[PDB]
Design a binder for these strands. Structure first.
Ligand SMILES: [Mg+2]
Ligand SMILES: [Mg+2]
Ligand SMILES: [Mg+2]
Ligand SMILES: [Mg+2]
Ligand SMILES: [Mg+2]
Ligand SMILES: [Mg+2]
Ligand SMILES: [Mg+2]
Ligand SMILES: [Mg+2]
Ligand SMILES: [Mg+2]
Ligand SMILES: [Mg+2]
Ligand SMILES: [Mg+2]
Ligand SMILES: [Mg+2]
Ligand SMILES: [Mg+2]
Ligand SMILES: [Mg+2]
Ligand SMILES: [Mg+2]
Ligand SMILES: [Mg+2]
Ligand SMILES: [Mg+2]
Ligand SMILES: [Mg+2]
Ligand SMILES: [Mg+2]
Ligand SMILES: [Mg+2]
Ligand SMILES: [Mg+2]
Ligand SMILES: [Mg+2]
Ligand SMILES: [Mg+2]
Ligand SMILES: [Mg+2]
Ligand SMILES: [Mg+2]
Ligand SMILES: [Mg+2]
Ligand SMILES: [Mg+2]
Ligand SMILES: [Mg+2]
Ligand SMILES: [Mg+2]
Ligand SMILES: [Mg+2]
Ligand SMILES: [Mg+2]
Ligand SMILES: [Mg+2]
Ligand SMILES: [Mg+2]
Ligand SMILES: [Mg+2]
Ligand SMILES: [Mg+2]
Ligand SMILES: [Mg+2]
Ligand SMILES: [Mg+2]
Ligand SMILES: [Mg+2]
Ligand SMILES: [Mg+2]
Ligand SMILES: [Mg+2]
Ligand SMILES: [Mg+2]
Lengths: 82, 91, 200, 94
RNA sequence: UUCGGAGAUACUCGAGUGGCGAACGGGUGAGUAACACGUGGGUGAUCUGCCCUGCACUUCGGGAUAAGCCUGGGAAACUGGGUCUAAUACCGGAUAGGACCACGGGAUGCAUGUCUUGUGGUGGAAAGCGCUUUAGCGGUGUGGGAUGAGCCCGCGGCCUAUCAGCUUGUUGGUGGGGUGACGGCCUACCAAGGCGACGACGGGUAGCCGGCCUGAGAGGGUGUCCGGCCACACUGGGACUGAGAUACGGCCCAGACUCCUACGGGAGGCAGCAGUGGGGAAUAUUGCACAAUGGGCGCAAGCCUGAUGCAGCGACGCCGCGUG
RNA sequence: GCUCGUAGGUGGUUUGUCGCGUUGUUCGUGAAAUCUCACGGCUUAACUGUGAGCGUGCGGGCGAUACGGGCAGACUAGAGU
């Protein structure tokens, strides 16, 4: 059959993508907590770090560029409304 | 990609061919994007006509001919015209 | 297939002689069978049937092929009967018969079958071959000097040559000026009854 | 040596469908319901048959009442069932 | 040099890492009365590997592991550990506009707006290998083509009223979430709507079409070869990888069935070609070749292709020719 | 059995306008094959290739306004008082 190689590589890729997406999720929830507190001080760079992480994930190919852009816009507007 | 290929549409022992511009992910005798010529390998040498401006259009826009179609384009001079080589007619 | 049977019976049923030649007449009346002397009912279907029979057995065509010839004729522009006659006349063995190279129709058919002719230098051996305008018909050059073909070399005077084909000198060759018009060429039948037969 | 980005190719913008109809309902919070009638020959008998539709249109500023012949232009799926936007209320109801 | 064994340095290459392919091609018509299909539009609401083409760049590092070797567990199927080594495998940086936010200009309109520009503030890559010497292959970001695809709409094509009331994410709105993309697609709240005699809801049947048969035509019947689209792959559900998945010869779970077992546990899926049993009135060879065309990988030669090209069998059909 | 009446269907004479129906023309589309007409090639035919039709339709533009319809009026012959 010799699709066992594909079976193994798919598992490795699944693990890498899962790790990356989980890291982005934690970054986003941290920023959401910062914005909910509304100090406007630490959120000002948590936004930068989170957007940088989203862009890095998009360049790595774990997510799609449009998804990265959507999340970046949503978070930036959330900051602007506070 | 996009290919310029030969589709067999004759009978059981007289392989007539049409020179069709088709996507590679398509069966041999499938719906072609555009037929631009024909090829009959049974006449005096054979019978060959290409549109010679639609062929130029497809070659310029990016279609990759298969190897027999490349042979026909070299015979008819369209491939030499497109690439920029001296002999534009060689039939 | 072919009929390959007594032609005199087949002429006696249809009340018309279709052969001529040495066996032109049987020298007797037309009771085609044991009850052949009966004065029988004459239907409208019978006339059409026997006319199409005459058309088929004048040329030795089979019903399935005559049927196709009918669609060709009715589907051709113009008229219908003359087109049917033209199609039935353009058959190559018929051309051989009409060019004065044959004692009858059957033996002309056999000469065509055994491949004794070339049209455009092409060896043909199908009786139902259709000749065309500007067709030359040539006898196979390695087939001449044979008895049944040279017996027709000197007897080329009695039966008239129609005015659409033409024969030439000792090299017996045929030229077709244009397609015939059988309606003015030797109709022993009315073509208007075949049409009516093929409508029911 | 277009030494920068090649502009575009020219294209003609597609045209949406414009229709005129009578308002049927409005009590729907920025949505209007318009009835459209059309006539078309019967496939077999040849008579001209009249039939009515009911499309749902969008009002960002909800001002349209019963009657009120209106003009509409079909748009993207603004909702589950809305595909039309109100253009202008011509010959407002009597 | 053993005189039966040695030497990766060496063309070549089993196993292995890595890339690409495997989503095409091939089968079947169970389901489906539906934007499934046919035809015409929209997408200012979208994506698109390889291919073409314009413009830029290709810069620094780092830690591992497969394989190998030594071991452990298991009946097997497989699997644990310790050492050990690379890469165009993986990870972190520098610079890089078509990412984002805010404020502006210039064009246009079809309401959302779209396109192009200016400033400020945030960001986002790359990979090298080869060379009988102009062997050659490559890599990343972007503008524009081509291609393929998604989604939305108008109209069209069955029977049944001895099915008359259906609907509560239902209909609409707002803020969020989610998607490649608009959208009750999802959620919290608010309003009370939406569909229906022009047949809603329900029941029966069915893949749809170019076409095929008939007919003077209009019509009627039909959807088999061939071609296009759709659906499915033992039954039901689910996701992952990827440019792209009903993922036929992939993965996970449940179920029925067949098989192995040391009883602890494992394996499988011809609606691919050929073939077997069964059902039936009834339908074929476990054939040959990659010679041609199409397809995949490779610089190429090449290698793979039951696609395909042919052959065998059956008067099963159409056509043609004989038995003078 | 007869009537009244809801949806629906149909509608007198006349003026203007619109151009939905209707009709003219042009562009796009209506794949290929199959079908029809003409050739071309297999010895003929079936079969096969080419060209023109067909594809009744739909969409876009530009004309016409007799009739139908819409919109704005008028009239008394139908209808009613
Ligand atoms: Mg591999
Ligand atoms: Mg966690
Ligand atoms: Mg968003
Ligand atoms: Mg026969
Ligand atoms: Mg909304
Ligand atoms: Mg190897
Ligand atoms: Mg490669
Ligand atoms: Mg792949
Ligand atoms: Mg598949
Ligand atoms: Mg089905
Ligand atoms: Mg549609
Ligand atoms: Mg190890
Ligand atoms: Mg940076
Ligand atoms: Mg790097
Ligand atoms: Mg709710
Ligand atoms: Mg909402
Ligand atoms: Mg079914
Ligand atoms: Mg009739
Ligand atoms: Mg299923
Ligand atoms: Mg089965
Ligand atoms: Mg399943
Ligand atoms: Mg890929
Ligand atoms: Mg993915
Ligand atoms: Mg599945
Ligand atoms: Mg299967
Ligand atoms: Mg299988
Ligand atoms: Mg697979
Ligand atoms: Mg089979
Ligand atoms: Mg039986
Ligand atoms: Mg049986
Ligand atoms: Mg091959
Ligand atoms: Mg090949
Ligand atoms: Mg039999
Ligand atoms: Mg009424
Ligand atoms: Mg009325
Ligand atoms: Mg009316
Ligand atoms: Mg009137
Ligand atoms: Mg066609
Ligand atoms: Mg010929
Ligand atoms: Mg028009
Ligand atoms: Mg009165």
């Amino acid at each position: 059959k010799s699709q066992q190689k594909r079976n193994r590589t798919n598992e490795r890729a699944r693990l890498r993508n899962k790790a990356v997406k989980s890291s982005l999720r934690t970054a986003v929830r941290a920023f959401r907590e910062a914005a909910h507190a509304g100090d406007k001080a630490k959120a000002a760079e948590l936004l930068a770090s989170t957007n940088r992480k989203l862009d890095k994930a998009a360049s790595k190919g774990v997510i799609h560029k449009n998804q990265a852009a959507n999340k970046k816009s949503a978070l930036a507007q959330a900051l602007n409304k506070l | 990609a996009v290919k310029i290929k030969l589709t067999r549409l004759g009978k059981i022992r007289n392989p007539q061919y049409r020179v069709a511009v088709a996507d590679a992910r398509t069966r041999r005798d499938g719906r072609a994007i555009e037929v631009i010529g024909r090829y009959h390998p049974k006449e005096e040498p054979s019978l060959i006509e290409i549109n010679s401006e639609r062929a130029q259009y497809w070659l310029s826009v990016g279609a990759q001919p298969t190897e027999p179609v490349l042979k026909l384009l070299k015979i008819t001079g369209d491939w030499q015209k497109f690439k920029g080589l001296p002999g534009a007619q060689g039939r | 297939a072919r009929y390959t049977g007594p032609v005199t019976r087949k002429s006696r049923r249809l009340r018309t002689d279709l052969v001529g030649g040495d066996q032109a007449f049987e020298k007797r009346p037309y009771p085609p069978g044991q009850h052949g002397r009966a004065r029988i009912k004459e239907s409208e279907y019978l006339l059409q049937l026997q006319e199409k029979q005459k058309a088929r057995f004048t040329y030795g065509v089979m019903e399935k092929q005559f049927r196709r010839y009918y669609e060709e004729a009715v589907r051709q522009p113009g008229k219908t009967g003359e087109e049917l006659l033209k199609i039935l006349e353009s058959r190559l063995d018929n051309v051989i018969y009409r060019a004065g190279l044959a004692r009858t129709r059957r033996m002309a058919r056999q000469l065509v079958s055994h491949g004794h002719f070339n049209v455009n230098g092409v060896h043909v051996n199908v009786p139902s071959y259709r000749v065309s305008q500007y067709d030359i018909v040539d006898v196979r050059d390695k087939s001449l000097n044979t008895v049944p073909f040279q017996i027709a070399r000197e007897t080329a005077g009695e039966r008239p040559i129609p005015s659409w084909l033409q024969v030439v000198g000792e090299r017996q060759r045929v030229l077709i000026h244009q397609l015939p018009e059988r309606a003015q060429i030797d109709v022993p039948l009315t073509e208007q009854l075949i049409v009516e037969y093929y409508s029911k | 040596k277009g030494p920068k980005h090649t502009p575009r190719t020219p294209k003609p913008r597609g045209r949406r469908k414009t229709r005129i109809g009578y308002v049927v309902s409005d009590k729907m919070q920025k949505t209007i319901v318009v009835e459209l009638e059309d006539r078309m020959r019967h496939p077999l008998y040849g008579k001209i048959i009249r039939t009515t539709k009911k499309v749902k249109a969008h009002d960002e500023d909800s001002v349209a009442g019963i009657g009120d012949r209106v003009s509409l232009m079909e748009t993207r799926p603004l909702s589950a069932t809305k595909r039309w936007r109100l253009v202008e209320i011509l010959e407002k109801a009597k």
